[PDB]
Point group: D2
Chain length 292, copies 4
């Protein structure tokens, strides 16, 4: 079992990642930490809690950074339309996500993996507030970046663009990094038949996936959970990656040295291709785990 | 009494600021928070605790950020030396930091207050920026921020930048875009508060723990000048009597561009940008007034 | 016939572009202008003149900018060698550059024209930018600019930047903000045109002066490819644009110092909502392209 | 006599610098080159030509760069004087070519005096790098080690073409910088105008017509009973450098887009440990300077 903390900004695809992480026997989901991103933190928190309540996921949820570390906040109704939820009974823990991340890593034996699928604000604050966490982190498997074309701008993918300075901290940490960028995640196109596949499986997870993906196309965040379940399903390439924090046309770009021209040691395993038959099989496996 | 939290990286002149803040009846020093800057946090924390122990200052001390929010860490081992507070000899340290992180202390204290607390940052702005972004509801709770840092003219660590800002430019950008009333004691002002041999003699002659401390500290730093300004303490002077310091309201922007002006406080002295002022920038200080205050504070420790 | 001025820094692939441009009946090559790039201008000029002499191309050659407009000069001595055109041995050089500076030639030729001339820059954009800013009245006279440079994906000289743009980013900014119709043969397209062992064998079979030159030239870059023909794609494009698929995009040149200096930022998906300014090369029919190269090379065989 | 080429964008104070340069026996004014700056090149050229015609200055005038080398053009155009119908014209040679050819043919004794944006100078330097050792010195009006004018960070001439200024400041040619810190001290008051006006002649009337306008639109805008003369300080410097205190500094031009675009970053305290590249103007003896202005005016009588 890979122990993980899932840091997210739900978010339609975050919800799918939560669904997969909380159920699969290859994953030990220790906690869910929430960051502002797709929407403001008040909304992403409610969204995360709504998902956990509907799926009866009893993992603690921690609210983190409501704002990026430096830049003016950007966002991408509720932030998770489609599924209708019960009146919210479950709540966030009283501990700040940044403190939770620090304390959990400090008390561990270095076997915990961070899985950020939102802006990297919680992660960067934790890293700079307690640098002793760095050798405690086994790996960081993040959804974010693009070696090719971004989405929010031609240069930048949303998660990085939303907090470039936080991304710079993470990408200069020296912790082993895995980057599921848009180049990879844009390949995981969910089609009506994928939705129809999951509906027939049914249960709480099946309906939620259907409700979410009907409203929404790529699933992005869930690829990080796929990767931790079976890395063989995803081809990566080791690259030296630098985050551009210059104001201007490449603000929040992940500059990926695909050809090794800079002669710098690689710092990231960059997602290249995904076996989508493998991936959807896994999504269904996770969906079927919620039937009582 | 102005309630303050003094955020600092001792630091020779930080220690002078602590001495002043903890004693003057116009100041209610609620807590001392420590940041990395002059030296690494392990050292600035020991330095701050050493000063409080020697002066018998019973105010809680909180350790904060050991690193800036984004950039690769720099120190000032240029002026402050090995420990970062050379000159005085301290007894073995028995006093310790609180278990609460400085960032949490700042948030909790501001959130629980009625908005009458002033932050006094005299190191890099790392603690302040983290507190602000972690809990933006603190913003209207902050009465004012009186910071030592910046320069409208020439910097120190680079031509463009003063050390506190240069040590965490992204943190400084957060503070200078917060919308909270700012007062900036930049180098243009603080370079005027040069401590001469006779200012040192004046404090030695007054004596007691604080006179000895001032003397050991400043006699060391003046030795490095032969081979000096007090900077941080002007923020405390300003809160005691703002009439002693002439300020000018300016729109100030922090440059976070990598390059020759990284960490520059760009101060619109002539108002050419047509933007509302966000900072009262220090222009001139009455040094007779200032040294009188320093002596007043030194005598408070006479036991 | 498309009238062109070919602006180049020979350069192995520049030589192939000269060979194609000077011979094909769809092209009226008015003049060759030389810029520093692959090597310093003294060398690229000698290289250009060497090519023209060997192929008996009687078109005037003009020396232009020896330096980029702002940055510290870089060369590509890694691929192109000591001379900038290592490989072919040339007879003693008897032919020479015209006395007119390339920048003046470009301005004068455009100003005197009826607006039917196309510029074909296949080196850094230094000559073009200087001409544009020295005489802005040339802008409406330029029919189109078909340039080799840039990359919407990965660069070559850095991960972000292609050599020609990287060698003079500020010049490239001028060209990409000129409002003149632009065609960009970037690396994404040109990397599809690799010259393998079978390509060299084919050309030298066709033989004669251009055959032997292709082979001597392209064997050196294969000997440094123990570890593409780029420039000639611009001439291919002008002969038959149907052989090359382009996509209209808003392209911006990044002149920020840092990891994307000299990047052509290409808005592939139109997310910025700005009007396209460039037809960006996407794919090339390589059967069509090599057919054209042979058509051109055959044109040189002797009686 | 110091041989100079005066590169300018007239411009009220450029006109004063022309007046001084063309008359003083310590200066050999070889040619005037014009650049876009204060106004577009069509207008600055006409302004330059008007000044020369009115003062009967017969030095050849060359039109140069109408645009900066990279950035989108900005402007800041010579009110006060009334000029007769213009008959003088620019030479047919582009100023950039003139500068290159004149330097290449020389023995290295010519000084360049740029008092507009540095566009002509940068293009000439990159077009023909062999001119660099031919340039004895560059005495420029531009920059500020403290506060700029057009932005808090930047002085107009540099701001108008930062990339050109980066070229000049990295050229290795000895530089003298009359920045705003110096020139803002050169305050022309009513008594200074009186002195020139009462000396009389064409240059005294021109000074007076120009500066009266400058003073009227210094009083109406901020009054402020005087206004700086900037460009002419470069000519004062070449006549007698003793009148102006300079300090050697390593200066770097910031070309980053943002709040310090076009800033001259001047290492006043030497903290970067880099060799000085610029003699930066610190203070001027204004009694000396106004005496010299009057002397120049009198040369036209
Ligand atoms: N447009 C858009 C905006 C925001 C997102 C969110 N950001 C990452 C991919 O960029 C994913 O984690 C999405 O949840 C995704 C998309 N597609
Ligand atoms: N050189 C030097 C570097 C850093 C400092 C510290 N930073 C501010 C002034 O820049 C003050 O807060 C000093 O504590 C002081 C000095 N003297
Ligand atoms: N490495 C390298 C460096 C420079 C060049 C030259 N620059 C453009 C391609 O980027 C072409 O115009 C080549 O002449 C080519 C290569 N292959
Ligand atoms: N405001 C103003 C703007 C521009 C100028 C022009 N630029 C330099 C001073 O910055 C001088 O060369 C003036 O001609 C002068 C003034 N006075
Ligand atoms: Ca997400
Ligand atoms: Ca301090
Ligand atoms: Ca080339
Ligand atoms: Ca001028």
């Amino acid at each position: 079992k890979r122990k993980i903390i899932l840091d997210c900004d739900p978010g339609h695809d975050d919800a799918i990642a939560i669904m997969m992480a909380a159920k699969h026997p290859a994953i030990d989901l220790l906690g869910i930490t929430i960051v502002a991103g797709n929407q403001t933190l008040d909304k992403t928190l409610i969204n995360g809690l709504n998902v956990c309540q509907k799926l009866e996921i009893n993992v603690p949820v921690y609210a983190g950074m409501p704002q990026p570390i430096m830049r003016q906040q950007i966002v991408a109704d509720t932030g998770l339309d489609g599924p209708v939820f019960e009146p919210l009974t479950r709540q966030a823990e009283s501990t700040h996500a940044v403190k939770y991340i620090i304390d959990t890593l400090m008390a561990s034996d270095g076997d915990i993996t961070l899985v950020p699928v939102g802006p990297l604000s919680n992660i960067a604050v934790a890293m700079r507030m307690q640098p002793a966490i760095l050798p405690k982190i086994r790996e960081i498997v993040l959804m974010g970046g693009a070696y090719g074309t971004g989405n929010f701008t031609p240069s930048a993918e949303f998660n990085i663009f939303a907090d470039p300075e936080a991304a710079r901290v993470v990408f200069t940490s020296g912790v082993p990094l895995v980057m599921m960028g848009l180049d990879l995640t844009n390949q995981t196109v969910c089609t009506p038949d994928v939705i129809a596949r999951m509906e027939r499986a049914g249960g709480p997870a099946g309906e939620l996936f259907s409700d979410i993906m009907n409203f929404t196309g790529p699933v992005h965040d869930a690829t990080c959970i796929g990767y931790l379940i079976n890395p063989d399903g995803i081809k990566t390439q080791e690259m030296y990656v630098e985050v551009d924090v210059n104001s201007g046309p490449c603000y929040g770009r992940t500059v990926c040295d695909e050809l090794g021209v800079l002669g710098k040691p690689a710092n990231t395993k960059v997602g290249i291709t995904i076996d989508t038959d493998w991936f959807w099989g896994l999504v269904e496996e996770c969906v079927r785990g919620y039937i009582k």
